[PDB]
């Protein structure tokens, strides 16, 4: 329940973008998170860490995101 | 008439340098 609350807060805070929320949940936020979240925000999936990129990729199907196509092409 | 117009090519952007 607590993790669900955190994920709902992240998903809402990132508009409806579940992939950025998943990145924020996996990579945390602040110490190494926010640079990668900003990199996500400007496209720039190369700057995002490899593990976070794979995590987003394995969540591609279940998560809905405006950035899903851009991650698919990357 | 006699002439047959060449069918279009997709336009791309090029610069010498």
């Amino acid at each position: 329940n607590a993790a669900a609350k955190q994920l709902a807060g992240l998903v809402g805070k990132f508009d409806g973008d579940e992939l950025k929320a998943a990145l924020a949940y996996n990579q945390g936020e602040g110490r190494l998170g926010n640079p990668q979240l900003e990199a996500y925000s400007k496209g720039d999936f190369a700057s995002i860490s490899e593990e976070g990129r794979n995590y987003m990729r394995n969540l591609l199907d279940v998560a809905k995101s405006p950035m899903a196509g851009q991650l698919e092409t990357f | 008439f006699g002439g047959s117009s060449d069918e279009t090519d997709t336009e791309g952007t090029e610069v010498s340098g």
């Binding site: 400007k42 496209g43 851009q70 | -």
Partner: protein
């Protein structure tokens, strides 16, 4: 000095946009344009300069 620097930096901005048109992702933000030591620092104004000069050039081409 500004005219020389602007020539170089519109050159590199043109390179980035030509890369973008081919399809590959380029950031096309003035901060992450590559500085060539002939370019100098990228302001926000040269994006506008490049767009306007490119439009005028496209109009000028025969």
């Amino acid at each position: 000095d500004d005219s020389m620097k602007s020539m170089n930096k519109l050159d590199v901005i043109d390179k980035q946009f030509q890369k973008r048109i081919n399809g590959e992702w380029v950031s096309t933000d003035f901060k992450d344009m590559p500085v060539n030591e002939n370019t100098g620092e990228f302001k926000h104004s040269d994006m506008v300069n490049y767009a306007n000069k490119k439009l005028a050039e496209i109009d000028s081409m025969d």
